[PDB]
Amino acid sequence: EPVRLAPEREFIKSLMAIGKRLATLPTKEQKTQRLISELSLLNHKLPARVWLPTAGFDHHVVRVPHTQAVVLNSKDKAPYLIYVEVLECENFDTTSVPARIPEEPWQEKVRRIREGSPYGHLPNWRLLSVIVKCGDDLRQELLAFQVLKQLQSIWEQERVPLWIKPYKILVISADSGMIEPVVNAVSIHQVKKQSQLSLLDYFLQEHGSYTTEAFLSAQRNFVQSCAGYCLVCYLLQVKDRHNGNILLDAEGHIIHIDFGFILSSSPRNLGFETSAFKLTTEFVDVMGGLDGDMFNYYKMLMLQGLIAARKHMDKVVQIVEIMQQGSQLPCFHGSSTIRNLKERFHMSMTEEQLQLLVEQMVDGSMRSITTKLYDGFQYLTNGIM
Numbered sequence: 001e002p003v004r005l006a007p008e009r010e011f012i013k014s015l016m017a018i019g020k021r022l023a024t025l026p027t028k029e030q031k032t033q034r035l036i037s038e039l040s041l042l043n044h045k046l047p048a049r050v051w052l053p054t055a056g057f058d059h060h061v062v063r064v065p066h067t068q069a070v071v072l073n074s075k076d077k078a079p080y081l082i083y084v085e086v087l088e089c090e091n092f093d094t095t096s097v098p099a100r101i102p103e104e105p106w107q108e109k110v111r112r113i114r115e116g117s118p119y120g121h122l123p124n125w126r127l128l129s130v131i132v133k134c135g136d137d138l139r140q141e142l143l144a145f146q147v148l149k150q151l152q153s154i155w156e157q158e159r160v161p162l163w164i165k166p167y168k169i170l171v172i173s174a175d176s177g178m179i180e181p182v183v184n185a186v187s188i189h190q191v192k193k194q195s196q197l198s199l200l201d202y203f204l205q206e207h208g209s210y211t212t213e214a215f216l217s218a219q220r221n222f223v224q225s226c227a228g229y230c231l232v233c234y235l236l237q238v239k240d241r242h243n244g245n246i247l248l249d250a251e252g253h254i255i256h257i258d259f260g261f262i263l264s265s266s267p268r269n270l271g272f273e274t275s276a277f278k279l280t281t282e283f284v285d286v287m288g289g290l291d292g293d294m295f296n297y298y299k300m301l302m303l304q305g306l307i308a309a310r311k312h313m314d315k316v317v318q319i320v321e322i323m324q325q326g327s328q329l330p331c332f333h334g335s336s337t338i339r340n341l342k343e344r345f346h347m348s349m350t351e352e353q354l355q356l357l358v359e360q361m362v363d364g365s366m367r368s369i370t371t372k373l374y375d376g377f378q379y380l381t382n383g384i385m
């Protein structure tokens with residue numbers, strides 16, 4: 001029995017077909033009801049010789065818990081999120097399809113699904129998640145994912161301890177795809193809404209006090225991820241940054257999501273911004289303030305990260321150029337997109353100049369901080385303060 005492709009195609013198509021039927025429904029409530037029925041049907045055919053390509057390890061799909069999926073918010077479309085139970089195997093080509101067994105945080109979902117699943121006792125059981133978008137073009141997300149992976153590889157190679165979290169994208173059609181969500185994390189919006197704390201106070205409560213290893217560890221993770229995404233947002237010109245599309249994980253890292261406006265995507269910023277990455281007071285406070293060692297570390301990481309990126313520039317630009325040749329995406333706008341991208345690597349600068357640039361960029365990223373208004377008047381008047 002060779003690895004047959006038709007089962008897999010039918011599986012992927014079934015997920016898209018579900019989305020299409022949900023999209024005929026006006027209300028979220030109705031889509032939720034329909035989704036339960038749809039997933040129950042899917043389970044008729046499982047386990048099967050099919051896989052979720054976003055897994056990143058060989059496995060068979062065994063179950064899609066039909067009550068546990070989520071219809072996501074959409075004005076027009078019908079995006080949805082499913083949890084998918086799989087059994088890991090070492091080699092998919094040699095492994096037989098598993099025999100059927102008859103019938104909040106990530107951590108609680110995993111617990112509840114495992115307990116309710118006839119497969120949940122198996123040691124090779126794993127829960128995966130995927131967002132199915134049957135009417136959204138994900139090629140721009142895929143480009144971002146490819147670039148993020150490349151930057152991650154560059155920083156690893158150059159031993160720069162920046163941290164980012166590329167999330168997997170599958171492009172199905174020109175107007176459909178799949179996204180592996182980042183599950184161990186909540187938007188900063190919700191972290192603040194639920195806790196009613198600043199991020200600093202949240203860290204002190206959740207991780208520990210200033211003298212604790214946990215606090216320092218979380219702070220280090222926050223800085224390394226902040227620096228990583230600062231560079232990502234600058235190089236890719238990621239726009240539409242807000243607390244709804246920045247997540248916080250249980251380790252203190254931030255994760256940027258939703259790359260719907262990158263590179264030359266309209267509308268262009270008219271406020272002379274170097275990047276839409278904004279370093280708020282709240283963020284600077286987590287780093288222990290403007291004069292703090294962790295803020296200095298942040299700036300050092302930005303410089304070492306940019307040095308590393310610059311050194312391997314062609315690896316990143318090539319990814320963008322290949323995507324541009326194949327596709328007519330909104331983030332491309334004729335010649336200038338690539339020119340401007342290359343210029344953001346600062347190939348002509350010395351490391352001394354790059355250090356000065358990082359200072360300017362960091363200063364600019366805090367432009368929304370009220371202190372900058374208060375203490376910026378020397379640039380706007382003939383006074384020296």
Ligand SMILES: [Mg+2]
Pocket residue numbers: 377378379380381382383384385
């Ligand atoms: Mg002046």
